[PDB]
Design a binder for this molecule. Sequence first.
Ligand code: HIS
Ligand code: HIS
Lengths: 256, 256
Amino acid sequence: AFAHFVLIHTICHGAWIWHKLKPLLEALGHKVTALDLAASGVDPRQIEEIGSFDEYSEPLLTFLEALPPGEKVILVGESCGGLNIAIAADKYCEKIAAAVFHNSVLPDTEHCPSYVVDKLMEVFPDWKDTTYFTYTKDGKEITGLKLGFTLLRENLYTLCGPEEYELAKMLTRKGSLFQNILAKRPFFTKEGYGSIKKIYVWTDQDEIFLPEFQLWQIENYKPDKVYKVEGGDHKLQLTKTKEIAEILQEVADTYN
Amino acid sequence: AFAHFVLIHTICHGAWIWHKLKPLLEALGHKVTALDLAASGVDPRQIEEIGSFDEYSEPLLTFLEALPPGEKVILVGESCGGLNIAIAADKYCEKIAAAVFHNSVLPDTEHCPSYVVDKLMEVFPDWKDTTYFTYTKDGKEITGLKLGFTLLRENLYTLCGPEEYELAKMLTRKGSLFQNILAKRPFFTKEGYGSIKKIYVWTDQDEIFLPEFQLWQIENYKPDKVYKVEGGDHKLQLTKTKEIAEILQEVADTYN
Ligand SMILES: N[C@@H](Cc1c[nH]c[nH+]1)C(=O)O
Ligand SMILES: N[C@@H](Cc1c[nH]c[nH+]1)C(=O)O
């Protein structure tokens, strides 16, 4: 079948990380939306005006609200994109055929929304040259971050070409995990997020979402389907684009 | 020699069009700055807050102001980047070793600053699906534009890969030529802009800055050096990146 894929970037990135996968999926006949989330890509807001991961997810929620009754999309999220998928499926589970997690966080319904992110910080505590700043929004002090260039080169874009890495240096923006607000956020629901089909895609070559973390997530909340891509690095949509397009063709053929 | 290249994008683009050339130049030992100009790339201003091509050029002027007495840069501009180079050389001709024009407008000192742009609109009057809007800034009605996707595919990125074209679709922003303000702008000076060494790089395969226009510019204001790259398309820094790096190595070796 042909599906409508909505591609969701991770924090500090934008729709541009999908510039290689999007043409491929369309060449297979699929419709692809690649959103900039708030204060990401060429979205005009700055991160200081955003007070939560729910506020951050506004372009996706507004997108899902705009879809006509009866059509469904496959949400594909990378790295912190998994949290935007949990927020959107709690409000629009009827519009979601399946969610694909691509080297992504996999929140559950049993522990606070920050749980998987707290576990990532234990497995991965050294963020090299990443800088931090704080700002206040709606009386909350938030810790923002700007990804360091050596962390981008070594851990996220390990095996990507120097020109792909260049785009990351040029285009990554200040973001936030909003970790302290995620903690106090109500849990993802069983009937919303819990009911979505979840396909987990990952590589053991990922240098930040290390195998210990990723296999830990698989055991904590079993995905409906798990696919392990051999080789690649953290940005599989850049180092293993064809393989991810094949996996996504197979997800379209199975879920609607 | 090694030089400091400052790479200047055209309107509606950002530093990201240089993501392929910048690694190459650095791999040859050069320093490279690739600026976002105002309301371009991931610069936070919107085009409605910009009232002229001089306001637009602010990141470049502030950059040139920050350089310590005695160091010099080679300015490399693409397409409307030629006008940012004329504005900057009228204020900082002492900081400029040479300016490279890359499929670029080549303003002169004899006619109003809009002259070459008025001649482009005569040679190239059909801008396909490009949209326009007007806004008012400092009592002037400006015509802004947003490049159409079929114009980007066919005329600007003709021969670029689908993934490079994808980045153009995802990242191009609303811009303005500020043509009516350019007309009333004082002429570029002979002692500033007129005294800069100008190297003109172009391809006859360019589908918007057609050979008639480009050869016309060469005859109107003779460049110090002219290089014609065989093949390629309008975005030579994407289709002929190595050839442009070689030409820029040779410009560094000759000018300082
Ligand atoms: N840039 C990060 C996004 C992230 C930072 N920290 C946690 N997640 C990535 O691609 O993985
Ligand atoms: N995007 C155009 C910039 C421009 C539009 N019109 C004139 N110049 C280019 O790359 O040529």
